[PDB]
Amino acid sequence: SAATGWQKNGTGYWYVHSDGSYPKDKFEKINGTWYYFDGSGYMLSDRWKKHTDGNWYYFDQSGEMATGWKKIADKWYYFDVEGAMKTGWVKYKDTWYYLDAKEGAMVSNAFIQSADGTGWYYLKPDGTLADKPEFTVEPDGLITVK
């Protein structure tokens, strides 16, 4: 906790073990919290990382691995309990949400094709699933949903 723990040489943070010594290019758990250190010892803060397990990870300005829902650059993302960004459907409370399969951001006000390519799910403006959507159709074929 003096020459042994969180260190700061201007550019960023690194961390010192009694002796392992300082993590680089890996994850580390520190007082209960996961961080990632770049190839040069420096903690990632406010940054996306695409890991070796094919997952996307986010680290806040503080360096803490994101877990659960997190608004980032004005878009929602859900991260599983082990910090992996999720895509597709997720259960949150009483309802369902859908996260782009490409960028991973929550989708809203959209039709999502069903897995078997046969049908659709509508997600409202706030992103929730419509359990009971309502349609109206005008003569030109214009559709409103609610």
Add this chain to the structure above:
Amino acid sequence: SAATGWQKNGTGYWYVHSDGSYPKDKFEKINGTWYYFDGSGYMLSDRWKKHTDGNWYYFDQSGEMATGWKKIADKWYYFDVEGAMKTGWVKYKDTWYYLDAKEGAMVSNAFIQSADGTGWYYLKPDGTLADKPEFTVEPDGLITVK
């Protein structure tokens, strides 16, 4: 997960067990996360709670018990790992912070009297402890610190 879990009757969220039944006026852990439900079964969201253990707890709009640093109404608070709002000194990374003993918000740009009433600690504008503060004094007795 249908007539058995997160429920929503307009006013707020309540939660149904196979059969305990629905928590009221207590904490509950649900899929790894702690919530609090008022005397009437409803999940607290975006709210301070003063618990029966004499601690202050915060619950975000989502209802999640706050843990770690959390900015709330434009002030910082550190919550211990079990969600109890902390006061006094805390260790964060390479430095120290001080949280008001009264309201619990982080203190910045201030002198804090040492425990034994004998000396002082200065915390900068961003709230960090000054390990090496510098003073200058003008003829009227005016002091700058840095």
